[PDB]
Each structure stands twice: as structure tokens, then as C-alpha cells.
């Protein structure tokens, strides 16, 4: 009996966060 | 009996964080 | 009986953090 | 008995790019 | 008895890039 | 008895790059 259970789990996340705040006056 | 359980778990995360704040006046 | 349990766990994280604050006046 | 022949040679040339540019308040 | 032949030679040329540029308040 | 032949020679030329540049308040 031949059993080839080929189940790859790919949970790799490629994230890119950016925030620009210009001239805060209070 | 041949059992080849090929299950790679890939949880590698490539992150890039940046924040720019210009001229804070209070 | 042949059992080849090929299960690599990849949790390697490549991070890059940066923050720029210009001219703070109070 | 079971004889298994596997020639597993993957060629992965995949490129994942995450480009981001933040621009706030520009004067001229 | 089970005889197994595996020739596992992966060629991984994959390139993951995370470029980020933060720019705030520019005067001219 | 089970005879196993494995020729596991991985060629990993993968390049992971995390470039970041922070720029705040520029005058001219």
C-alpha cells in the first residue's frame, strides 16, 4: 500500500504599513 | 507499506513598518 | 514499513521598523 | 513491497513585492 | 520490504522584497 | 527489511529584502 499525503500549509504573510501626517497644530 | 507524509508549515512573515510626522506645534 | 514524516516548521520573521519625527515645538 | 520513484525538482522563480510610499503636505 | 528512491533537488530562486519610504512635510 | 535511497540536495538561492527609509520635514 502506497500513501503519499502531499498537504503543504502556506500561511506566509507579506505586509507593508505606512502613515504620513503633515503639520499638526493645536 | 510506504507512507510519505510531506506536510511543510510555512509561517514566515516579512513585515515593513514606517511612520513620518512633520512639524508638531502645541 | 517505511515512514518519512517530512514536516518543516518555518516561523522565521524578517521585520523592518522606522519612524521619523521632524520639528517638535511645545 | 512497494517501490516508489520520485524526481521532485521545483523551479520557483516567483517574486512577491510590497511597495508603499506615504506622502503628506507638499508646498511649492 | 519497501525500497524508496527520492531525488529531491529544489531550485528556489524566489525573491521577497518589502520596500517602504515615509515622507512628511516638504517645502520649496 | 526496508532499503531507502535519498539524494536530498536543495539549491536555495532565495533573497528576502526588507528596505525602509524614513524621511520627515525637508526645506529648500
Author numbering:
A (entry chain E), B (entry chain D), C (entry chain F): 274, 306 to 330
D (entry chain B), E (entry chain A), F (entry chain C): 272 to 274, 306 to 330
Cite, word for word, the article reporting this structure.
The ordered assembly of tau protein into amyloid filaments defines a number of neurodegenerative diseases, also known as tauopathies; they are the most common proteinopathies of the human nervous system. The physiological function of tau is to promote the assembly, and possibly stability, of microtubules. Here, we used cryo-EM to determine the structures of heparin-induced filaments assembled from recombinant full-length 4R tau (2N4R, 441 amino acid isoform) and the corresponding 3R isoform (2N3R, 410 amino acid isoform) to resolutions sufficient for de novo atomic modelling. Our results show that heparin-induced 2N4R filaments consist of a mixture of at least four different conformations, whereas heparin-induced 2N3R filaments mainly adopt a single conformation.
